[PDB]
Design a protein around this ligand. Structure first.
Ligand code: 39I
Ligand code: 39I
Ligand code: CL
Ligand code: CL
Ligand code: CL
Ligand code: CL
Ligand code: CL
Ligand code: CL
Lengths: 344, 343
């Protein structure tokens, strides 16, 4: 087959480029951002995904700057990056060489959905815990993801490892500076984003994470809608009509619906700790939502802290407990809960 | 067979209650609004659509108060309306049933690697600009324009605008929620969260329908506001600081992609022209509904010879009221062709 050789910069190291050669190139992905290729590195034989984007040249790439800062077992690794022009008007492209990961939570959820099965609660636990860890970490640097949705949660089905990807909307949120309210994909947008607020916090990611939890339990999206009006009605149908207090803390012709009791929303064989968790992730008032770390520590995740827990495929669980000081900074006293007696 | 009989108020005219009996009740639609039943009237055998909705005890239903003032050949007729019954009260809207929708028609053609013949595009788009010219005449904005909300009669080629659930009168200086309109058909001012938007949002949406029927697929798709604005910039070029001012800030600098690359080879120039004039960053730089009716793309409809493919007459395109033309009366001299003046 054909071989490409580029001079590429490692993501973690100090700016010291080396000759990286790769082969078996194929398209996998399209969209606003640009294209994603898959390839095999010639030296290692490891598979990589290459996200090719257009570069301003005017300003430096915010995705690239944020990803160089990040090192976490539950976030896709940037191995290298390199520039190519190919054949556009002296147009320049930034190529991000990332880890290849052979599945996504979107693809998996949909296999169980179009089989009228429900994803076994154990996986729901493994995947939602590793997401909340990845948020705990990036929230500690004040970085908000702003795009949290199933398509952006990579899985290795053999190791049960989840890896957060797609930092193209990610931004550090400084209290008092405003931010655009038109980020986050439809279905997972926080009510304050729908109401057009520009003084929102990292809590938008917690609401999005809650919408992923509900969807893995129900086997389909919980707040669907082609418009915001449609979206708000599906929310008010579950949380009821926000009070004057609650509206004021988000950002006015609202129908009076009594709150549908939470236990009546999910199928009946659904664990009540999974429901408690939802009620505490999907709150109208952003400041009343759990923190990523507060979530990791919820009784819903207790099975993962059992010393005998094993994967359905018979392998051990992946890293769940190797917390850093950084990751715990939000609230260190929780370490006594997050790190169980048996853990190294 | 089963038979429901109610006492209904008429939608148009004065308040003289009437007995209405229908049968073959069937569900045809579910969603946030409530339920849409099809039914067959006992006496006439005519098909109707009943839209059942939760009635606030607080204030009277706005969709109702609006639809009762509306009488136009390109807007679904409200035949009757009644209150009924969860242990609280529902508002029902008895409306003409119309057997097709642009959504369905667009899709039948789309997955058969086919575009809809341009003649139907002209007919359907023309009748839509007429309906907007009418409601805008009253300062009422629809705020939902999308293919699913455009009813069709495949045989007559009559298009009817439905769903006045988001519709509202826009007074200047009064603000309005920016979270109305359906993904794909939202004007950039709504994506940017603006609350001083005018009826020109309806014109942007209409323009997305035009472009979609021509292209065979939506033109500005994406799961997020951001993804949409990228598809918009890949076609219109980068908004200038003045353009952004007129809607109300770190955008990828990209050149305006010539509008003729956008459409398949043999697309009418005049179709492409009308798009560039509906899909403008600057809300006030967009054609009014009535100005679009009079665009050269619609010239073929004004031809006295014009026939539908099945050999039938086109429907009523020229019977304009004073109410309809108040946006700009002089336009009557293009809108009403010579052959429609003949006594
Ligand atoms: C969002 C949009 C596009 C993509 C690329 N599509 C994709 N990526 C995969 N893996 C992937 C992407 C990446 C880098 C872009 C993050 N690493 N690994 C896999 S595994 C089975 C289907 C599939 N589709 C991923 C997320
Ligand atoms: C918007 C919302 C709900 C619907 C109901 N679904 C529906 N309605 C139709 N016609 C319809 C609706 C109406 C009034 C409720 C608006 N009149 N005629 C037709 S004809 C072929 C499929 C179909 N589906 C239509 C548009
Ligand atoms: Cl995916
Ligand atoms: Cl991506
Ligand atoms: Cl439809
Ligand atoms: Cl047709
Ligand atoms: Cl409707
Ligand atoms: Cl003539």
């Amino acid at each position: 087959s054909k071989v490409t050789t580029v001079v590429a910069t490692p993501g973690q190291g100090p700016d010291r480029p080396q000759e990286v050669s790769y082969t078996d190139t194929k398209v996998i992905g399209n969209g606003s951002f640009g294209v994603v290729y898959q390839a095999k590195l010639c030296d290692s034989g490891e598979l990589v995904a290459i996200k090719k984007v257009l570069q301003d040249k005017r300003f430096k790439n915010r995705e690239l700057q944020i990803m160089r800062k990040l090192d976490h077992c539950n976030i896709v690794r940037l191995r290298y990056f390199f520039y190519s022009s190919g054949e556009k008007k002296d147009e320049v492209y930034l190529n991000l060489v990332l880890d290849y990961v052979p599945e996504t939570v979107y693809r998996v959820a949909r296999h169980y959905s179009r089989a009228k099965q429900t994803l076994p609660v154990i996986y729901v636990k493994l995947y939602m815990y590793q997401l909340f860890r990845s948020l705990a970490y990036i929230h500690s640097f004040g970085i908000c993801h702003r795009d949290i949705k199933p398509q952006n949660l990579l899985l290795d089905p053999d190791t049960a490892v989840l890896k957060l990807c797609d930092f193209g909307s990610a931004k550090q949120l400084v209290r008092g500076e405003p931010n655009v309210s038109y980020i986050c994909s439809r279905y997972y947008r926080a009510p304050e984003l729908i109401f057009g607020a520009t003084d929102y916090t990292s809590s938008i990611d917690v609401w999005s994470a809650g919408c992923v939890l509900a969807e893995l339990l129900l086997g389909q999206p919980i707040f669907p809608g082609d418009s915001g009006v449609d979206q708000l009605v599906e929310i008010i149908k579950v949380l009821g009509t926000p009070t004057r207090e609650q509206i004021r803390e988000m950002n006015f012709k609202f129908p009076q619906i009594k709150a549908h009791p939470w236990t009546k929303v999910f199928r009946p064989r659904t664990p009540p700790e999974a429901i408690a968790l939802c009620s505490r992730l999907l709150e109208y008032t952003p400041t009343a939502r759990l923190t990523p770390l507060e979530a990791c520590a919820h009784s819903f995740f207790d099975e993962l802290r059992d010393p005998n827990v094993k994967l359905p495929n018979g392998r051990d669980t992946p890293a769940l407990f190797n917390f850093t000081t950084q990751e715990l900074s939000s609230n260190p006293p929780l370490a006594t809960i997050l790190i169980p007696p048996h853990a190294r």
